[model samples]
Target chain A: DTDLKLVSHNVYMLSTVLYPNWGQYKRADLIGQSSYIKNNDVVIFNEAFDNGASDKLLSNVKKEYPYQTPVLGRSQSGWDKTEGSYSSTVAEDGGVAIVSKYPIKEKIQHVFKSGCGFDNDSNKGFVYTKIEKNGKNVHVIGTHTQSEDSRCGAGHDRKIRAEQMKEISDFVKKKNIPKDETVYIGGDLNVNKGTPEFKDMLKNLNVNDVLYAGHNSTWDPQSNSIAKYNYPNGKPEHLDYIFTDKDHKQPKQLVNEVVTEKPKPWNDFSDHYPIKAYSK
Target chain B: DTDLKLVSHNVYMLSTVLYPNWGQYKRADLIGQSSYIKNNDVVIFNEAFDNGASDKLLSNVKKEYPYQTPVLGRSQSGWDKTEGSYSSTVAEDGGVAIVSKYPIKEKIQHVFKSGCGFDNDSNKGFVYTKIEKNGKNVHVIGTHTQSEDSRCGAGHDRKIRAEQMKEISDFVKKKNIPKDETVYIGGDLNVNKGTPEFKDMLKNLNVNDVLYAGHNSTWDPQSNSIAKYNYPNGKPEHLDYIFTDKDHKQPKQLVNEVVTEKPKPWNDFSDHYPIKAYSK
Candidate 1:
């Protein structure tokens, strides 16, 4: 059995404008400090960084990821200027970009419409890619969706975002893909668990939130994120998700550690903190 | 039986722009929508609009609500400006205000001192009005406390708010409110159902959260406004409230709409939502 592991972090991006501590990136040496990846048989990373530093650093370290994709989706290329403000948060659209330990065979990025229909912007934030592992192909998709509100629809934008989400279900089921294979999906969804959209999507897929695998998405709780800046209140959420279709074997242990060093006191490193899970 | 209703909304009103389609007036309208008001019954309101046209429009529209004080305390005219970004959703001090359908007697206002000690400009919002029902004095109080923060014991502001709240509790206890009479207290409380401040003050005062009066606070079985705001997802806690004096007759039906004019859609009328309860 090939050792497989997954790690993710929503790095607020090392920019003076954003963190002011951009210079600390080299000092913290996250990519260098991450020898833990070497410890794992396989590692998966998403929402790694905004610009190209995440990819560059991993490559420079000769991390040797057998499978990786820079930014396969339109939305992941860059974010749009949010309607009102971008004060403490980044409005940039850096969808789920990843590096894996296996060969990636396919990639598909889909965008949703902004109206009552699915598909919000031309840069729909959806990425569907396939990676080969242990003679089995696993489907991994990345996405970031329109938040609860959009200037286009006072709050009705929710309906539009939900409609667009229906696209994923269409691709998986209508495409008639084998349900027995591993299907790993993860990203900053912008919606909470149990929400009408999230619940609807899960119901359609006949899937239970992956948080149940270790971290508690249900009554059964697991390790929360390590990022102290992540959730001041230790409540676990699927804001950043890693869900699998019935085919994939759920990991035995999950870790959502609080990252304190790089992201000082955790007051406002980024509106969102990242989560990482380990398995073999 | 006089058709009576108690109402309160955050209204998201600012000096220039009001939330919900710049319809701060609509909040007043939403509260006014409950047409059960009559010569004998009353409607209480909070976060009323600021000066000029909006104020005049609300006054004339809610003419049925005979008594209202102009905006209270000239405080931060607007929220802190950040990165050239402004959200009508955030408070601009919009100092809390109140209005009643019945004649206002024993109307006393006090600035609770935002406990954080940020500056004298900080707000500790509170209001007291005597609503006479059937020729009997029914003391009604409304308050919006200082938010908890890390600075100078901002959470301590909760203690300050609680101390001031004790004043109200003491006043009521001194009067020995009759169990049969209806004494209603409601407003944007800024405290959760189980927090020490809320539990200590109201529980001591013997005021049961109207939501828990007949239902659980958790959404799985939550009733009233707890369900309306889609609680937990948006309003995980009951910060806004309507607490009846221990002896005051409890209302039969209470509803919280959470409103639809928030964050470009159904964000919230304010950081907090409105709570309403109807008693016969």
Candidate 2:
């Protein structure tokens, strides 16, 4: 029985409220999952479009990862991404966030920027913060990779993901990602490990694909959201991955990849498998 | 920072407990993308089956690893195989089974078998179990894969799954499986993973064509539950699977393979998904 646990989720865009029961889905899955997260543990979530929805979800669960970064990106109060909806007109739809069950360092670090490698206005994706866990200074940088292929084409998408990595490295360099502590650059890194660009980017920063034991390989848990749409030679592929900084602090365990692509009655859950890292 | 946390589920057989409030089509989509489990975390699942339903839509899972052993088996219980119905004689019947984080020891048992043979007094079904996750045992097994096959096949209609493989293997084998441990074997293994032979006549203990990882060619996942009936490859095959007989201490990181099909909003909720590995 372990006491330290962490859970991260990308709330699509909490501001896209047009889908009435949208938050409910997040609550059911995110909140439902977090139920196991005991108080005094840390839960980090990125790209929650609306602070309100995230707040509601956290509160609904009776626990909270209260230290939130800013929604300094875009979109205001009544934001809805769907066509002809209130959020559609509200610009500024970016908000990278985090919630922790432990006492967050009163003085925390939060970062929000443009391009970083992605492209103009694609700034809504990544965020970083510093929290001390168990007397250890751990660095946590959460990001929502750019999903737009047009504004952030293959090149730009590549640029953003890589740029985000560089930025994290820069932060570590400036503040020294504790040599004895765990530095987790975890979140939805939309680029799959199979992609050359994604690989090259990680290489440049010396970041290792923490999913494996000996070698540094990427893990893109396949997007099993549809039939005949995700399989490769009748098998699926992985597109999302969680990476860790060079040093290790918490003993880690990589649970088997979770892909939920069933047919009926089980639809409506999130589109991605939530990956977790524990500091044992 | 959140407290000790985990993402667990009780899919309520899924035959009737649909996840989405939307129509069936969307519900199917939801079931397909529901990644409720995170990588590297230990998880456990209860009631991951369809029990008495003739949906022919169970045991379809996609995992990178093979189904572990101490594989559970099934024989009779008056369940209809064709239309997913049950004989009026059997009332709300089903069994429990488990997969593991470690290799299983030998010895399988058809607990309900009559001393004689398959047709010996309607020898029915049984359970398969094994220990996993840090030496903690997790037991699992499946129900009968009969009804239609039994009506037209043999005297021990359902039991004839392999005809005698169902019950005979349980007793005939000179080996002994440990009881009183957390063991599991799930699914309706109507026929052997590859061979259709009963345990009574298992000489040299060899079987074939059953693609899966296990010993004696005696094990392999039964069938593609969802595809078995709906996909272009709607092939009627064996029904379920399980893990039994504690071989050694289970591993630290444990999980089920099937539940990772897809996240909610796309998953069909399944007639079957591998049970979670139990460990510390």
Candidate 3:
């Protein structure tokens, strides 16, 4: 049986000016090292909007994945200005994107009507694409939801994220695909396992969280990544996920791993870790 | 090098009516199978206060752990009657206990001042013992804090649990042992990895969370255990832990495993799975 290797990562690609000395192509190399982009048959990247870094990454991996989605962009939350402390007003859309080795049949993107917290200024949504593999049509969905509050209290973004989840679930149902067809949703949802958003997504969308069952955190705190903002002292959490239809058979393979080596200043590559799941 | 194998478990030993026909002595067999109790040098148990079940367990494991702590009782919540819908009268005291093969030089137990939600009706605390292994002194501490709200909300009892952790840490400090001496704290802390209680215990108390950095949940929801109340629909959480001092060397072996073959009515053994740590 042929197995599909799927990876989801939030490659924190802000902008090139944050690390001017770092070459754009090198950022691609860094992304390559973070998740070994060459190894997976399909990849979903969040924060892949930074012009230079993502372009380099797309250039590097384009040969492997001939069929890919255009870089989904969001103009809200200007990247260069935010990181540069308003010194440079370089407005950029670093949203979400996907690439697949299989033939791409169709693509659908839904920008959430309501965003949460700092992400309210950003366009956040779910991206779905139809890919054909050996006469089978697989529905692959990628999403990046409202980011949570880094400075902890009772995760202020829960209500807004829940709203976004409701929207996504509604969108999924509208697709009206046959029950027998398989559905795979992968992305940095920003909602942890026990949160209301997580619970609602499973119940409302009829999905199963594939990665967290066997692994603790997709974003390893020990790794040198800016994702440390979740818990500055380094507490790990499962912010990224790959969910399958609840009725679908368990994925043939799921890898719980951490990519230790990354580009310098770590955040240059991304804060979130990569998770791979395979379905046959 | 001689190694000390330690196990921590919350053996959910409820009243007799729940499993009267199940045979009193048979509960011991269930506990034995749940943790593979025969393999460890030292073991600590919580909710092990059922007068009959624990006695049976002691009788069963006596050959392995000749030296054992008395089963501490509780005055607040009555075990046998609580399960029978005896609403007004709560007469139960099933605290924590410890046992070991190595000679127990001294044993000390403390009941926490603050108890969580439903647990407030039942007394809870920390238990510590000094064991002699090849002329060396080892401090073993076990405890179960306020059980967090498993139904999913902001962990309501974190502050209370944090207070309990502080008490445990202060008690460890009061021991006034030599800096070089090794210390191990194992039990159902009821706190997940990213929670404030967990982070504080490690930072303020100077200890390392053994299993979470590498493993996921110690309490497997898939098991036929009453521990499911924490995550209802088979959602796993790392409620149990074995923490070691930061300065202390790593244990020779740490096995985060689950015993698959458990007796019926699952609660017969315990809700929480057993975690084993070995030091040489």
- TM-score of every model? 0.35, 0.39, 0.41
Off by over 4 Å in 1: A14-28, A35-49, A57-64, A74-93, A115-124, A148-154, A174-176, A194-197, A204-206, A211-237, A246-280, B1-280
Question: lDDT tens digits, residues A117-175, model 1?
Answer: 22232243556666777897666666555654425656566665566556555656654
Please give, as one word, the docking class of candidate 3.
incorrect
RMSD of 1: 22.7
**What are the RMSDs of all candidates, in order?**
22.7, 19.9, 23.9
Candidate 3 lDDT over residue span B190-209, tens digit each: 76657556677676556765
lDDT of 3 by residue, A1-280 (tens): 2346676777766656754533333445445433355656678888675677777677657788878776654432311111111111224442677888888888766666765455555556767787888987777777777776554246557766677776766766767866666677767777666755677767655676443233455565454334443346866656776666665434555433323334222110001011110111
Q: Per-residue lDDT of B1-280 in model 1, one digit per residue for the tens? A: 2214554544434444533333333333332333322332343334443554246434643666666644444333421211111123334332555566666665555554324554223334555666665566555666555554556463575676666566556655665667666566666665666666666767544676544222222222123332343334443444556667666765565343332221111211111011110011
Interface RMSD of each: 24.6, 22.1, 24.7
Runs in model 3 lying further than 4 Å from the true structure: A1-3, A17-25, A33-35, A74-94, A150-156, A194-197, A211-215, A228-231, A247-280, B1-280
Q: Which candidate's lDDT is highest?
A: 3
